[PDB]
């Protein structure tokens, strides 16, 4: 609403993908992967917004009832300006950006870094909570094509990285929506590190401001039943040691 009242507007008034993957148990060491915002980078990325996106399209979400039919909006032309919406949100992350780099300075007051850690927090909820601001049916900017438009991209974002992985000979064992974890059939953990990093860097390549990184490692991996596993969480320590410590969820 402040952004909008900033720019000369008139607001209104006040009244997701499961994978499927291949079935097998593995032992070996197991490296967890997340997408950090995917929504909010999927926004930010092809410049969705409320007055940079049209309405007149039949993919499938917002037809009439004429048989099971609808319309998704396509993507905008990339010549057009950056809508409200993304503008905001890179805002927001620039100015994350900037705080998390003023940490970096040395011989700092103890207070100075309390701000500075719950400055950054607070962005990084603000961030995160900006597609949920849209998702929720009842929100009063609720607009059921812009989120169908960019559930579908995410679904094609993690179509096109499975199909990545698959090429590159890495067994896509198990994924769910932004957290994508592999096996590597290795024992090393610098080798699942550097394999890990090379492929966080090759996704980089593929969106500016899509971003990936390491969660988390794993020694074995047993599972029992959905949503159920069972594995050792390796902790790497600064001389390339590392404790393999049991996890049950």
Not at 80 to 100: S, T
Not at 162 to 179: A, F, H
Not at 185 to 205: D, P, Y
Request: proline share 4%.
């Amino acid at each position: 609403l402040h952004a909008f009242y900033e720019n000369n507007y008139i607001v209104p008034d006040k009244q997701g993908l499961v994978l499927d993957p291949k079935v097998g148990f593995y032992d070996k060491f197991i490296l967890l992967l997340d997408f950090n915002s995917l929504y909010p980078s999927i926004i930010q990325e092809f410049n969705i917004c409320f007055t940079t996106v049209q309405r007149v399209a039949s993919e499938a979400q917002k037809v009439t009832e004429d048989g099971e039919q609808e319309q998704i909006p396509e993507l905008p032309d990339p010549s057009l300006e950056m809508g409200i919406l993304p503008r905001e949100i890179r805002k927001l992350v620039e100015r994350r950006k900037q705080v998390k780099q003023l940490m970096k300075q040395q011989d700092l007051n103890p207070d100075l870094i309390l701000q500075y850690d719950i400055r950054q927090k607070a962005l990084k909820l603000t961030a995160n909570s900006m597609y949920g601001c849209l998702g929720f049916s009842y929100s009063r900017f609720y607009a059921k094509p812009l989120a169908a438009l960019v559930t579908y991209k995410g679904r094609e974002i993690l179509m096109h990285t499975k199909e990545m992985v698959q090429k590159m000979n890495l067994e896509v064992i198990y994924g769910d929506t932004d957290s994508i974890m592999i096996n590597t059939n290795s024992t090393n953990l610098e080798e699942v590190f550097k394999l890990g990093n090379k492929v966080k860097s090759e996704v980089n390549k593929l969106y500016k401001l899509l971003e990936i990184d390491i969660d988390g490692v794993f020694k074995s991996l047993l599972l029992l039943k959905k949503k159920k596993y069972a594995a050792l969480v390796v902790e790497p320590t600064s001389d390339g040691n590392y404790v393999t410590k049991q996890e049950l969820k």
